[PDB]
Amino acid sequence: SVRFDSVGGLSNHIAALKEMVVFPLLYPEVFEKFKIQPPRGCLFYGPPGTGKTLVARALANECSQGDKRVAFFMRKGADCLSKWVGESERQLRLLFDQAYQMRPSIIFFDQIDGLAPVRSSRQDQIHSSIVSTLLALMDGLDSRGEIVVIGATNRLDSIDPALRRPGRFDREFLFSLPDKEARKEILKIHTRDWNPKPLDTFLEELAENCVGYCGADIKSICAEAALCALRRRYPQIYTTSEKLQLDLSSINISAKDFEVAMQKMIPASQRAVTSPGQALSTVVKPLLQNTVDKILEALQRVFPHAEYQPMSFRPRILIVGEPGFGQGSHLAPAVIHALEKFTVYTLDIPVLFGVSTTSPEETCAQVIREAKRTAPSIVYVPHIHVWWEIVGPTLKATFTTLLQNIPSFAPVLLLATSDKPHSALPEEVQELFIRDYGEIFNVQLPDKEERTKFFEDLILKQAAKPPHERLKNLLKTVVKKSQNYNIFQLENLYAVISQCIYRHRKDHDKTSLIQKMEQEVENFSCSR
Amino acid sequence: SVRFDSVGGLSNHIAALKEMVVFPLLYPEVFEKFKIQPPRGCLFYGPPGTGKTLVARALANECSQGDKRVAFFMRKGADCLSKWVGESERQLRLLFDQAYQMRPSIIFFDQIDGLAPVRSSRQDQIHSSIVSTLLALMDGLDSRGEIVVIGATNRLDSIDPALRRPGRFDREFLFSLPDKEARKEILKIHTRDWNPKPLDTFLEELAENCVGYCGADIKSICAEAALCALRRRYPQIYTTSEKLQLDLSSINISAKDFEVAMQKMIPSPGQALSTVVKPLLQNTVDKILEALQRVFPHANACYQPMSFRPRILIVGEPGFGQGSHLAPAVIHALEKFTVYTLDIPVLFGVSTTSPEETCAQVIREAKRTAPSIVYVPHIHVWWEIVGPTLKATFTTLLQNIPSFAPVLLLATSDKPHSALPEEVQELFIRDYGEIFNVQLPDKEERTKFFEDLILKQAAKPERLKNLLKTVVKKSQNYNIFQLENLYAVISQCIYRHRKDHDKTSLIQKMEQEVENFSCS
Amino acid sequence: GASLADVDPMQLDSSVRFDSVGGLSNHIAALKEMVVFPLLYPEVFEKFKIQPPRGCLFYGPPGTGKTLVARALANECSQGDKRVAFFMRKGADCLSKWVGESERQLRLLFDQAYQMRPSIIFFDQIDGLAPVQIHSSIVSTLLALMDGLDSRGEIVVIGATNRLDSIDPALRRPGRFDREFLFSLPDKEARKEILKIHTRDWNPKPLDTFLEELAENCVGYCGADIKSICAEAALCALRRRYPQIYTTSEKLQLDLSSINISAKDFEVAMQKMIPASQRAVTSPGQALSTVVKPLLQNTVDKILEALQRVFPHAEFQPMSFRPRILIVGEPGFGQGSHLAPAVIHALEKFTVYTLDIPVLFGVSTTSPEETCAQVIREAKRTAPSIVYVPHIHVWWEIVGPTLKATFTTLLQNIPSFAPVLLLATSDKPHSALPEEVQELFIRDYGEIFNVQLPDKEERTKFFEDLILKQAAKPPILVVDHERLKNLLKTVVKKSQNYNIFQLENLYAVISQCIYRHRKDHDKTSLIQKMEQEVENFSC
Ligand SMILES: Nc1ncnc2c1ncn2[C@@H]1O[C@H](COP(=O)(O)OP(=O)(O)OP(=O)(O)O)[C@@H](O)[C@H]1O
Ligand SMILES: Nc1ncnc2c1ncn2[C@@H]1O[C@H](COP(=O)(O)OP(=O)(O)OP(=O)(O)O)[C@@H](O)[C@H]1O
Ligand SMILES: Nc1ncnc2c1ncn2[C@@H]1O[C@H](COP(=O)(O)OP(=O)(O)O)[C@@H](O)[C@H]1O
């Protein structure tokens, strides 16, 4: 049924696999020249929903329907556990011996953590016995060739470390959340055999909003979209116990269905945690997207790992601006979001202090150690000008002598924001961001063009929908009287006009809100 | 087929083993002259992969090969369990007679975790009875020769504590991860019989870069490298069909294949210099090590070394790499000595312990393993980061250390020796050899720092030499940070002009970018 | 076994019986009348009524023979009434902070102890079982189980520990642990007895004078160090004699007549090891090293003579009144580095407690007010004793306002005629110390000693047996024997103002040259090097 085509995105855990399963059968001489004794054990692991059981399934299908003949034995967590006194460790050896007669064969253990927990003398003796009789008869597996043992898990730390050793489980595969190049393939696989195949550009657009999703999260919106189309088209289905008469020809899926379905959906990875990076909303985007792009260009100039081998030496950048220019609230999370596939580690006040029972120094050390472990990563310290005059005198020392110990050309990025200009910051901070290296970005107010696009939809498209030159003058005067607002005032004059419009929904004729609009625009006052 | 020469690294474990288990059994008339009384139980323990069963197999084969004067009973100590009422405890009482009729004997118990676990209200009636008979066949049916029992394990606490008592399993052998020297002979052993004989410099460098590996990993990187050659040489091996025609002579393993397999696999205040920085600071590291030799000669009667309160302080302006590159490279070169760090993120990066208590145990453990090193980097900020009790503890602690005990105190500083507080100034004695002032590198070094880039990669498929000269003409007073920053900036253009056959166009951009690199 | 627990006794070796224990003679003459006599003569303990105690506590540094005495004692009781059982538990073994396993383990252990009867229970390292309700549930049951042994028994409990102050004070009450025994590092006359015990069953028995010589060269050893150097001096002889046995698995023929042990096999064993007094205990008292002896032995003898004026127990109806002494000197005259520890070590048989910085704060991360009270109370409990406060000129400027108030009032609650000495050292002169410190030493009472530099002769003899003999050792041809003496005199003249930290550095910098010229058969390329290193040595 399913055989690799469906498996979209991974494409390298698959090539790395047939050199364990297929090659020792086909080319058993290259392993003799170097005396290789090829590997015999994988260990799939990663967050939930990201593949690896789809992979086990597709591999079983390739074996059963490919080049005869390979056997496939599958165990589900802990099945050897039996009621009598010895029938537990006997079934394991029975399985390994039956797999030797049907060889070549591959053994698959789903959800290891119920079978091989970390041994301890404060637990059941049967678990230690099972782990021992499992790492015994797997060590004596060289003479019993043509057997491959795979095990998929979720908790790599909950597996006995005596098994994660070359000889028992020598390869370890990481199944991570897809990125915008893989989510598009997945969406192509799931909307594959649809009546009116969704345009490639449409899926290209859909793959962007789905940031925290996985294969299981993407498979489900393709179903919620159809379920939304069904009740959009035929609303006379819920208010009925009997059947109806459908034509199955009027039911078509549109982008509104996908968006209303994505409204209800919550990614399985963000059901109990919130990531420190968001995107510009549909409102603020025509106001700051170009600024985001310029920031990314400068970051490329200083952090070329974001585009034979990129050379980077301690990449840092500091986004500076006036207190309302939107750098710690709008710009920096958007920059974090546009740079996906880099793990992000946050160091702001509610992280050092918003978690007690652990001094700030501990968490400050853990963040940098883990960011070193998996490079290239980002360490996000927003609002340093307040961060600095809120911490202790030893935390400054720890923070400065912990990122001086980072290898120079290791690609770890330090991102920070500021409200005071660079000159006003404490001189100890100014030593970290040098201007001649291109590590300081100064945000500026948006130009006339931007401010025009920001209001160009409210006037004149929303103020013309029932249940023109007089509107263009309103647009002109709004853009003129707002040429020196920050972001927090622009997107308030927006809301002020937004509310005005909403209060005239069922009014069948205009020229009651037009003058109301212009009066509310005239009463607006702030001036920083 | 394994007899002691297939074990790299454990040159002291093997000697102690045959000086305590083998020789009292082979030459009983010798150890009776002195009443040495060998043990009746030892125990190997350590992390997984460190050669615990390899030593057992080697010892068995060295007990068989010869004249068979000693018998070896090898028993994986978990398959001795019978799902019955009294049979597993009879195999034990039989194993001990089968080895008393053939004395001398060594009874080996591989993985005794599964034979004698900790009995409590989570154990069965079979394992408790097994322990009760095992610690009766040993304390009673022994103490005269010539049976010696060994057992292997990973955690020393996964065994019943009643077995480790005076008169029972008492001696212990800690198998730990290999250091940089053992990791070289391990690679030699695992590349013993090879077509293309590898060089010794290659294995040396590899052993340097394979940090954190434990033996078995080193056997694995050899395999994963040969899998990187094949894919490099026959990219058509995948998505194909049955073999047809393949030559097993163009699969030569190259040096860049080890560095890919070492990243397709998953595996301290001391780090060697990178390949890029080495030809810039290796000379200074040599000079520092020589000054150490001057003060630390370990790196009644005379004609053995003798030192007096070894102390050295590498001083240099900020940016001279005296605490970023130099001192950890020197700690690396001075391996085979145990190092103990004392800096900020190790005094304060842990709670549930005082900074005054984590400073006394460090000096205690440094005295127990002398000659050792105590490493305090950046004293010019270390001194103003601790409390007034920690200073008065640290000073009296390193004062109570005996006069001639070879504990070295290594430290660094960015402010000059005359800008430090008096309490520190009266701790190094510049009139002695205890202060070392770093200098900028010489023209010879600086020039050779850029040569692979200019001119051996901008011309990689001339006027470059001129540009090269200019690179040395403005970099005269650059510290290490600006130096390697300028080197990384000049290595960027090249990576941007990868697929540009026509030259003289990236040379112009290069000479204008190096004309713009300002680092005042 | 229906009791899934560690309750089995041990089969002890029968060859340990009041003959292998060397150095511990007062303790044995007391344990054999509270453990042995109630079992051997049971008619005196019923003639009147006695019901002897059921408890002993052993404490002291590690390796001092505290398990060995329990073993010897269990073998000594079970010689007429075979046989006394022996149970041994060791605190902190995979049962700490596990409720409620430890309670039933202890209950079953006491049950088994009752079933055998007579028996001896031994808790090695109780610090892991009753350290100062995971904690109350287990100590309360231990107290109830111990306090429930009938007066005659016959069950005897014994406990061992390293620091007496890491044990719950609820244990030290009569009927449970009514006596305590201190196992200290052995002096010379006990070191000789241990050496005679361990080298007793040898064909070619070592000479008595050689054992006398050995007992003095290994100071700071604890029992197990002597065992380790005796059993390793036997391996060096074999290794040096037959080095071709290490590369041959085939048992070759060896003559058991050329493997006789000699010296230079004991000292090569004593080289590669570090003693007990330099490993763990932070023993405040250490004797002068063999290098510094000829320089400071006279000062050490002078202090111990101005110390019997105040502390007339330093010559053992003596009567003293608040014995105090303060040795003062310049910063480098070695009062807190060489003199005071050697003075303390000379005063063995007197228990010594220290109050210095790494003990108040570093060790035992508790409040520094309870540790000072502990040391004062236990110092007067075992008087005559010593309290040692080194470097008061800095000690006083590091403690809090409450610690001074506790210390100054705790040494006035000591009875006036108790022999509890207070020894302190300083680097500022007496009149530079804070006034609360000056109001403790009354120099007209003789409580002050001023250290001075070593005399000309002292320095001469200090450099002599380095610069005349070791500078002419045949590398195993031509030595001058005349300019060596001139160099000795120039060195003695040049160094007539150094303190000790410099006087003993100019001794290590001159000995280095000799090492760099080990093999040179012409002893001339280092004489000039010697005198040019001395010509460039500045304070
Ligand atoms: N890379 C992918 N391409 C296509 N579909 C996918 C992919 N990953 C997941 N899916 C879909 O999501 C479903 C769940 O996948 P799967 O069960 O393999 O995840 P998992 O890692 O095994 O989850 P868990 O670890 O919780 O068991 C699959 O049935 C598959 O239809
Ligand atoms: N010191 C060493 N020298 C050479 N090879 C080694 C060494 N240590 C390990 N190896 C290689 O790694 C393999 C695994 O080592 P080994 O099984 O002896 O240790 P182990 O896994 O701790 O043993 P066990 O865990 O089964 O008791 C060996 O077959 C050997 O080839
Ligand atoms: N006083 C002593 N006399 C003879 N041998 C001793 C003495 N003290 C220690 N030893 C030797 O040291 C070994 C270990 O001593 P041990 O009793 O374990 O010390 P601890 O008191 O710390 O338990 C003993 O087996 C014995 O061989």
Short mmCIF file of N, CA and C and ligand atoms in Angstrom, two decimals, chain A residues 6-10 46-55 57 110-111 152-154 175 178 182 185-186 189-190 214-217 219, ligand 1:
data_model
loop_
_atom_site.label_atom_id
_atom_site.label_comp_id
_atom_site.label_asym_id
_atom_site.label_seq_id
_atom_site.Cartn_x
_atom_site.Cartn_y
_atom_site.Cartn_z
N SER A 6 4.85 8.17 -0.20
CA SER A 6 4.11 8.91 0.81
C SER A 6 5.06 9.58 1.79
N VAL A 7 6.06 8.84 2.25
CA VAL A 7 7.04 9.39 3.18
C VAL A 7 7.74 10.59 2.56
N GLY A 8 7.22 11.78 2.81
CA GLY A 8 7.80 12.99 2.27
C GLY A 8 8.49 13.85 3.31
N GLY A 9 9.69 14.31 2.98
CA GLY A 9 10.45 15.16 3.88
C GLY A 9 11.75 14.59 4.39
N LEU A 10 11.78 13.31 4.72
CA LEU A 10 12.95 12.77 5.42
C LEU A 10 14.09 12.48 4.44
N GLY A 46 12.41 11.21 18.34
CA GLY A 46 12.02 12.57 18.04
C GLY A 46 10.68 12.91 18.65
N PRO A 47 10.18 14.11 18.39
CA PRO A 47 8.89 14.51 18.94
C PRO A 47 7.76 13.69 18.33
N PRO A 48 6.58 13.71 18.94
CA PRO A 48 5.48 12.90 18.41
C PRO A 48 4.94 13.45 17.10
N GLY A 49 4.59 12.54 16.20
CA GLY A 49 3.91 12.86 14.97
C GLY A 49 4.79 13.10 13.77
N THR A 50 6.09 12.84 13.87
CA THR A 50 7.06 13.30 12.88
C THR A 50 7.51 12.22 11.92
N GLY A 51 6.83 11.08 11.88
CA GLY A 51 7.26 9.98 11.05
C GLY A 51 7.72 8.80 11.89
N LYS A 52 8.57 7.96 11.30
CA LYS A 52 9.28 6.82 11.88
C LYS A 52 8.41 5.59 12.16
N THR A 53 7.11 5.77 12.32
CA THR A 53 6.22 4.62 12.27
C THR A 53 5.61 4.49 10.89
N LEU A 54 5.34 5.61 10.24
CA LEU A 54 5.14 5.60 8.80
C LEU A 54 6.35 5.01 8.09
N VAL A 55 7.55 5.29 8.59
CA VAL A 55 8.76 4.75 7.99
C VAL A 55 8.85 3.25 8.21
N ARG A 57 6.40 1.25 8.66
CA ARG A 57 5.34 0.65 7.85
C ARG A 57 5.74 0.57 6.38
N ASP A 110 8.19 -1.15 18.76
CA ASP A 110 7.48 0.12 18.85
C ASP A 110 7.34 0.52 20.32
N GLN A 111 7.67 1.77 20.63
CA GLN A 111 7.60 2.31 21.98
C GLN A 111 8.46 1.48 22.94
N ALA A 152 11.73 2.24 17.86
CA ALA A 152 11.29 3.63 17.82
C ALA A 152 10.80 4.06 19.20
N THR A 153 11.19 5.26 19.61
CA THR A 153 10.84 5.75 20.93
C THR A 153 10.53 7.24 20.86
N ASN A 154 10.28 7.81 22.03
CA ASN A 154 9.93 9.22 22.17
C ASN A 154 10.79 9.83 23.26
N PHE A 175 14.15 12.36 14.11
CA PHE A 175 13.00 12.75 13.30
C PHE A 175 12.48 14.07 13.85
N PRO A 178 9.10 19.14 10.37
CA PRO A 178 9.48 19.55 9.02
C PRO A 178 9.68 21.05 8.93
N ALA A 182 9.72 20.84 3.42
CA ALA A 182 9.16 19.51 3.63
C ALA A 182 7.66 19.54 3.87
N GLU A 185 5.95 19.30 0.55
CA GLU A 185 5.87 17.93 0.05
C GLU A 185 4.78 17.15 0.76
N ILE A 186 4.68 17.31 2.08
CA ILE A 186 3.66 16.59 2.83
C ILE A 186 2.27 16.99 2.36
N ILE A 189 1.45 15.40 -0.75
CA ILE A 189 1.10 13.99 -0.61
C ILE A 189 -0.34 13.83 -0.15
N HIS A 190 -0.80 14.71 0.74
CA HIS A 190 -2.12 14.49 1.32
C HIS A 190 -3.25 15.03 0.46
N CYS A 214 3.38 19.21 12.23
CA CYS A 214 4.10 18.01 11.85
C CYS A 214 3.29 17.27 10.79
N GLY A 215 3.71 16.07 10.42
CA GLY A 215 2.95 15.32 9.43
C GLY A 215 1.54 15.01 9.90
N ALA A 216 1.39 14.68 11.18
CA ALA A 216 0.06 14.39 11.73
C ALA A 216 -0.77 15.66 11.87
N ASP A 217 -0.14 16.80 12.15
CA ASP A 217 -0.86 18.06 12.19
C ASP A 217 -1.28 18.52 10.80
N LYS A 219 -1.86 16.40 8.18
CA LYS A 219 -2.88 15.48 7.68
C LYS A 219 -4.27 15.86 8.15
N1 LIG D 1 6.90 12.82 6.81
C1 LIG D 1 5.60 12.50 6.63
N2 LIG D 1 5.04 12.44 5.41
C2 LIG D 1 3.76 12.12 5.24
N3 LIG D 1 2.92 11.84 6.25
C3 LIG D 1 3.35 11.87 7.53
C4 LIG D 1 4.75 12.21 7.79
N4 LIG D 1 4.92 12.16 9.12
C5 LIG D 1 3.73 11.82 9.66
N5 LIG D 1 2.80 11.65 8.72
C6 LIG D 1 1.39 11.27 8.98
O1 LIG D 1 1.16 11.35 10.38
C7 LIG D 1 0.74 10.11 10.93
C8 LIG D 1 1.45 9.83 12.24
O2 LIG D 1 2.80 9.51 11.95
P1 LIG D 1 3.68 8.57 12.89
O3 LIG D 1 2.76 7.65 13.62
O4 LIG D 1 4.74 7.99 12.00
O5 LIG D 1 4.40 9.55 13.95
P2 LIG D 1 5.19 8.95 15.21
O6 LIG D 1 6.49 9.68 15.35
O7 LIG D 1 5.18 7.46 15.09
O8 LIG D 1 4.31 9.38 16.47
P3 LIG D 1 4.63 8.80 17.93
O9 LIG D 1 6.09 9.06 18.17
O10 LIG D 1 3.74 9.62 18.81
O11 LIG D 1 4.26 7.36 17.77
C9 LIG D 1 1.10 9.06 9.89
O12 LIG D 1 0.05 8.10 9.76
C10 LIG D 1 1.24 9.82 8.60
O13 LIG D 1 0.04 9.68 7.85
#
